[PDB]
A paper describes a structure:
Top2s in mammalian cells can be divided into two subtypes which are type IIα (Top2α) and IIβ (Top2β). And Top2β is associated with DNA repair and transcription. Beyond the vital cellular functions, Top2s are considered as an important target protein for some of the most active drugs for the treatment of human cancers.
All DNA base pairs were visible in the electron density maps. However, no molecule of compound C-Bi was observed in the stabilized hTop2β cleavage complex structures. The structure of the hTop2β-DNA binary complex revealed a looser assembly pattern than in hTop2β-DNA-etoposide ternary complex and other DNA-bound structures. However, the changes of structure were mainly located in the DNA-gate, and there was no obvious change in the C-gate. The distance between drug-binding sites Arg503 of the two monomers was 26.62 Å in hTop2β-DNA-etoposide ternary complex and 34.54 Å in hTop2β-DNA binary complex, respectively. Similarly, the phosphotyrosyl linkage that should existed between +1 nucleotide and active site residue Tyr821’ was weaken.
Numbering used by the authors:
A (entry chain B), B (entry chain A): 452 to 618, 624 to 1118, 1135 to 1201
Write the structure that this text describes.
DNA sequence: AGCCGAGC
DNA sequence: TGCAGCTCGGCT
DNA sequence: AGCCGAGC
DNA sequence: TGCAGCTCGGCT
């Protein structure tokens, strides 16, 4: 033909076309898996063609984007399909080169989404094909369990998890690429277990597909996921299993059951990775990046590409690394309209306001590291209070961090899921610190306007969650105006191509409005000088300059959707709602921080006490350890008043409160240096001990608010340092 | 005006053409440096055009490769040159678009080489231009020193090194890319000290250029570098300076002085990075890689691209990282005809014999780590005997590693320099181990034939350093032969395309000789089955099958050129020369290893002695340390028989033995565990002490030859394990 | 006529 | 940043 | 009609 | 493994 990545069945287009199956694979390695799996014999009736990734949702796409979609058009050419055609009698089916399409994807949520889009494609264009078995799938296992003789295959994590309810070598298949050639030829030998047939069952199949993929069914999807989330929350409260879909010998799957028990898992997982948490402002990928950074604790820059590989490994990030690198870049950007406080330093070219960051260099050629602000906003001390998650016996990132200000409002959370989307604008950090200080003194918080670091324009409320964002334009003389700010997130080059150039050149609907203009930007600032006739500039000030030069955009925030501290999606009407809920939790954790520090400092002081009485007890000699025995001396030591390691006797302890959530050791004296008994080391132990006694008391005095205020002071000091240093470059 | 990377002087080609200078830069960053350095003002009379890297040596190039060289053709179009033309009267000069070329390169040896090739280009094609000031250079500093007010520039490392004027912040410029825009505009403001003009002085200039770049002057270059190396040995023996070339206010440099004082430094550095050392078989880049691996001590695979960045940093490798990655790949390859013992593991697709390794994947996508054989061949214990080099104030790789067999013959050292080249074939490791064992027992070594791991053919001597290498071909029946080995370094696809295909298809000079052939290879083996008429097969066996099917190559080794242990180039006539010279050195270092271990183990036992007598003294109470003073016991313990840390009293001392190359510490008792006074710590010290006494005695009895034999045994066992494991995959 | 490889 | 097509000497 | 970004 | 052109919802 003329399609490069296609491997056409030898019998395709011939006389056995209707006995031919085209295999559509998620990506190029899946294709390789298919071709080796099919072998020599399989090339007669089985084609293989790979799609790059997600494909166009044709159901309400535009005519133009449909007719220009090379991948959709390739499928149509391979299969021999024809739009508007009905495939019912024997003449219609003579034009097909293939009789069926078999979909082969990762056994994961994003695979289910691709299958859904393919189903959506056939359902919307050739329902005569879809009602008569034209579509199947080739499933493969997500997890395998091998005892010694017999090898097991599980097609979903809940199936595998529940099989553990019996009593031994476990391998995980993250994508089709994990399988080997020998495993592939195995799968295709057992076609009867791996081929599943999509059955069309009635109108409820149409309703289901439409519910998942129609632009007119956003409300229905909201209800649909709300049921799923609460209903899952229930089974998961009453310890019931979570249902899975490929445990039976059934070779049939209705479109309704696919949508409602498989595609819905993608939709829910999509919201989980795309909608941020109220508590720390992160999405899970972001949180993993930052957990990895905290773990490495890099004193020097790290190449973005390398940090991504490190993040993937250290935190169990199972997606492609390009996206992770894009996430790292987005976290480090610091131009006007991106982050108000970038937690990662952009060491290299991470993007500018001239192109909205799309001029960032390759992640192989730029570097980053923690901003000095990062551990001031996410104090390491508080790590002792989080719930670290597990991914296959590996401890990874927490469910959320508990920062000292609501980061969710500092950098403007944004995410698109299914059913819901999130858009929060940026808020000034100092204004938030002040509102926290107000609430900490029993005052009501002040209402807050959106505010973008280094933005020189103005933002004014219009109604609730509606704001007028304006740049800066000045009249210079009767012929000249100067533009010195664009509205937030209007990029310099876009404005120049879409506003000034049409004003200079005229259009078909409008003649030219300006006579000339020149540019005078820096990397981080905007200066256009625009020339006009006296008359035209007089009618531009009359008609309002911000209007004429399109220096005004609306900003509407009626979709502030976030996961609360419990992991429930929730819609916040105002940012003050968000700030009160955050405040209310963060103040609780300061209470546990004070509690936790009391326990540890106490163990540290009780420790320093046993360490103390021993040494000065053998300074004058009331106990002997010379040529005794481990046997004797531990029992000798319990016999007297000496405690087994109090720090290790307070860590094991606080465990056991969290255990129930979802021998004697005197080494601390005895591992002590032999030096510890000398007057210029004994006097230091008494001071250290007496200092530690005061440490617990100096903190015993403090309120949680006192601790929070301390953190806030330390933060604003560094923020002053860091931001003015930024300005001197 | 159709060339993409050129920035043409606004006045180029116009009427001031002969006042225009084209600037040729080493790469695209140098170009950028030139454009910002020149600014708006400089674009009238100054062009900028970048060359990718090294360029064609046109002096005896072929007509075809000259006429097809896009870069040389680009220069000719930009400047307006014309071959065979003489540029003398005013009509001839009317065709030039530019009056002179200014060369801008790194201030390093590879920059000088590029300048030389450009000079060579002009000298060979337009001597009327080169004799009348057509060529200049723009030098920049390699080192800068900034005091507080005044900033200094050095244009050669010996000049910066030669400045005994001492009493302040030193920066190094590795390439033109180190400079900033501000530094560039500075350089171009001071055009008068950065522009140097090449002067043609007489025939000695022609002789010098010809000496450096003519294919007929290899012998002369050999003499030329021999003088340089020996004369340098002298200037560096009596502690005299090495003259440098840009310290004066002279703005003129003859071609003869450029060749003989600047280009020669490239020629010598070229041999140093391309000609291996006899002692360990490495080139300096390779040695740096392996030093980095030994340092990291990676228990797990590392991305090749990442290891390269690590090597650059950890070992001060100042060249581009693409080349380093190629070196890592070459070190890890293990197909037939590459390494007999790959010291790095090829974890991924590092190349196959089907394409001579040129099918290796990208270094961003493949992994490696030390072979378990590496520290068996280069024992870590022996690192204490090496001379680690210094780059700036960083300790880096040694001058050579001294392995337990002559690695220079295991993997076939090869390199192309200037004046000399090196080619060693592979030699069987077990045959070398046996020859070392023979020499270790006072026997003469056996002569050795080249031998390639997994090569199934034969290698036979023809004369001195000449060998017939043969693949394997069999007669199967009256119509069929089978080819099961190609001669070493004949790659499968090349043989198929250049031998079998012309035999199958015929050519214009010869008709077809075979009727069919089929392939049956693995990734690591060769199987062709070839069909012929009975008559044709009979005339092929008569004429000899290895001849007919070109399964025989000659291997000639009359250029076994290596740096000896002193860093002098040497030409070895036979492989036995190489092995005897290696033998005498390696046997010496086994003597120092025995010496070193004796000294160290002794300090360790003298240490365990003081540590021992001490504990037994306050076991029964002959010393009191309870509540005394650091003041007191340093003199208290020295007053009595106690030695300050002997290990750290054997290292500090042994330092100063290498110094001449070019208070009391009793913490080891007192930092001891408080447990040191215990039933199971006293007897544990007595065995430990008494074991260490036996340690020195078991080793005092051993000969150096005994130690080498031990190493060889441990090595051969692991080579047996590793090589059969290789065969079961 | 072009390979071998450490460089630009 | 490295590109792509070259360097350098001795064979083949 | 297209941005916003975490995914394939 | 990523490509390139998409998904998904709410504005603009």
């Amino acid at each position: 033909k003329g399609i490069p990545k296609l491997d056409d069945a030898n019998d395709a287009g011939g006389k056995h076309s209707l006995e031919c199956t085209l295999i559509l694979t998620e990506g190029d390695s899946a294709k390789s898996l298919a071709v080796s799996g099919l072998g020599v014999i399989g090339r007669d009736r089985y084609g293989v063609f790979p799609l790059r990734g997600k494909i166009l949702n044709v159901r309400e796409a535009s005519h133009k984007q449909i007719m220009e979609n090379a991948e959709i058009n390739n499928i149509i050419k391979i299969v021999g399909l024809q739009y508007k055609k009905s495939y019912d009698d024997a003449e219609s089916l003579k034009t097909l080169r293939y009789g069926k399409i078999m979909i082969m994807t990762d056994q994961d949520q994003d695979g289910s989404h691709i299958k859904g889009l393919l189903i959506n494609f056939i359902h919307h264009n050739w329902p005569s094909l879809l009602k008569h078995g034209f579509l199947e799938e080739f499933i493969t296992p997500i997890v395998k369990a091998s005892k010694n003789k017999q090898e097991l295959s599980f097609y979903s994590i809940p199936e595998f998890d529940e099989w553990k309810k019996h009593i031994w070598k476990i391998k995980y298949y993250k994508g089709l690429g994990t399988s080997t050639a020998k495993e592939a030829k195995e799968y295709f030998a057992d076609m009867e277990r791996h081929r599943i047939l999509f059955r069309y069952a009635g109108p409820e199949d149409d309703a289901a597909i439409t519910l998942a993929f129609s632009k007119k069914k956003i409300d229905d999807r909201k209800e649909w996921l709300t049921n799923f989330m609460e209903d899952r929350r229930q089974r998961r409260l009453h310890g019931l299993p979570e249902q899975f879909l490929y445990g039976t010998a059934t070779k049939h799957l209705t479109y309704n059951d696919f949508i409602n028990k498989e595609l819905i898992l993608f939709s829910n997982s999509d919201n989980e990775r795309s909608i941020p948490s109220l508590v720390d402002g992160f999405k899970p990928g972001q949180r993993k990046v930052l957990f990895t950074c905290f773990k490495r604790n890099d004193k020097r820059e790290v190449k973005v590409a390398q940090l991504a590989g490190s993040v993937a490994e250290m935190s169990a990030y199972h997606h492609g690394e390009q996206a992770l690198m894009m996430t790292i870049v987005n976290l480090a950007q610091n131009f006007v309209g991106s982050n108000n406080i970038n937690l990662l330093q952009p060491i290299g070219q991470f993007g500018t306001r001239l192109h909205g960051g799309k001029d960032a260099a390759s992640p192989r050629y730029i570097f980053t590291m923690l901003s000095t602000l990062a551990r001031l906003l996410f104090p390491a001390v508080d790590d002792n209070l989080l719930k670290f998650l597990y991914d296959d016996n590996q401890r990874v990132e927490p469910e959320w961090y508990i920062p000292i200000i609501p980061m969710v409002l500092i950098n403007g959370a944004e995410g698109i899921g299914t059913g819901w989307a999130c858009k929060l604008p940026n808020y000034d950090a100092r204004e938030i610190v002040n509102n926290v200080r107000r609430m900490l003194d029993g005052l009501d918080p002040h209402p807050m306007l959106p505010n973008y670091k280094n933005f020189k324009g103005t933002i004014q409320e219009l109604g609730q969650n509606q704001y007028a964002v304006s740049g800066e334009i000045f009249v210079v003389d009767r012929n000249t105006v100067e533009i010195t700010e664009l509205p937030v997130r209007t990029w310099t080059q876009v404005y120049k191509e879409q506003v000034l150039e049409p004003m200079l050149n005229g259009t078909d609907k409008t003649p030219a409005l300006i006579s000339d203009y020149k540019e005078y930007h820096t990397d981080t600032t905007v200066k256009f000088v625009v020339k006009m006739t006296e008359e035209k500039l007089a009618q531009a000030e009359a008609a309002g300059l911000h209007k004429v030069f399109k220096l005004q955009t609306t900003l509407t925030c009626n979709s502030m959707v976030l996961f609360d501290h419990m992991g429930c999606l929730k819609k916040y009407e105002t940012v003050q709602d968000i700030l009160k809920e955050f405040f209310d939790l963060r103040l609780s954790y300061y209470g546990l921080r004070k509690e936790w520090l009391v326990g540890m400092l106490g163990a540290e002081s009780t420790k320093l006490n046993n360490q103390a009485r021993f040494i000065l007890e053998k300074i004058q000699g009331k106990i002997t350890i010379e040529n005794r025995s481990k046997k004797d001396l531990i029992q000798m030591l319990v016999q007297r008043g000496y405690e087994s390691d109090p720090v290790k006797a307070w860590k094991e302890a606080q465990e056991k409160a969290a255990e129930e959530d979802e021998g004697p050791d005197f080494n601390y004296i005895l591992n002590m240096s032999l030096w510890s008994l000398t007057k210029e080391k004994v006097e230091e132990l008494i001071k250290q001990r007496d200092a530690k006694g005061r440490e617990v008391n100096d903190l015993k005095r403090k309120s949680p608010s006192d601790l929070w205020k301390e953190d806030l002071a330390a933060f604003v000091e560094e923020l002053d340092k860091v931001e003015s240093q930024e300005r001197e470059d």
